[PDB]
Structure 1
């Protein structure tokens, strides 16, 4: 009830919590992806992969493999796959955070490489 009241108050005032300013890609605006404007999907999910090898049964075996930064142009179908080598992560700490930064850097580099015409919106 209290929460509801708070919400109502907010509405009245038109205060809102940050969230994110940019508009989310969604089922609603999925069709927006395939207009003439140039775009690039980026994925940092595969940058620091650890592996714990597991078969159909699930037997244990430890290792830490190479990663990648999947960066895809859905118009042209190009895939600027920056392969992150495992040597990067040797003697490092706060690893996940570092990975994100690395990914960002890579993206920036890619952008720089692309000319003004081919660059993404």
Structure 2
């Protein structure tokens, strides 16, 4: 990571989402709700968020499996919409079920290396950040939305440091959302800018936050 090669992490976790309800008759109803693909460049902080509207499942079955293919389809479609100089050199997936669908969808892109990973990068935690969660919930059609998940961090820290910070935030939100949100608000006056994802904190504040988030993850 972090060299001249454009790298994307792709997360399919959140593509097929449902609500499950027990009926008065005692059976379970499962209803799809909107999902999202997260495509993330760890050097620059760029996120492509591809909102998956429930209409894409119309007429279909085995939706959890089909979601792997839909993810690969949408990654390929994004790549074909980009100039060659913006296309990734490497795609990294933390779900093994993505490898074969990507391979078949990307046959026309021989430069692109696909690999698996055991890294813990839980973008599902973003569904807990209201900016993302409501946007996904309320969508009435597919769409793609761009974000910068590093805010203004790269003005003063490296991509390596930024990536590490982001991962600690996401993992902490995943393990204990309520406590992570408290750690991320060290003062009554702590705020997040409207165009930012994360709070505006001092260097000293981030140092403490990062240690606290790490400790929260360790405590599970």
Q: Give the TM-score normalised by the residue count of structure 2.
A: 0.35
Question: Of 76, 79, 94, which residue of structure 2 is paired with 1:108?
Answer: 76
Deviations 1:62-101 (A, max 9, x none): 6431010101111221111110001111231122221111
Q: Point out the more displaced range, 84-93 or 61-70.
A: 61-70
Residue in structure 1 matched with residue 14 of structure 2 by the alignment: 46
User: Residue 46 of structure 2 aligns with which residue?
Assistant: 78
Residues 115, 85 of structure 1: alpha-carbon distance in 2 compared, 3 angstrom cutoff: same
Superposition map of 1:27-38 within 5 A: 33-38=1-6
Q: Secondary structure at the match of 2:10?
A: strand
| 3-state secondary structure, aligned to 1:34 | coil
In our comparison, the structure showing a higher alpha carbon Rg is 1
1:96 aligns with 2:64: yes
Cα deviations by residue, 1:40-71 (Å, 9 ceiling, x for unpaired) = 11010000011248xxxxxxx96431010101
Name the one with the larger strand percent: 2
* Structure 1 unaligned spans of 5+: 1-32, 54-60
Q: Does residue 67 of the first structure (1) align with residue 35 of the second (2)?
A: yes
5+ residue gaps, structure 2? 22-28, 90-220
Bigger helix fraction: 2
Between Structure 1 and Structure 2, how many residues are aligned? 83
For residues 106 and 46 of structure 1, the distance between their equivalents in structure 2, rounded to whole angstroms, comes to 14
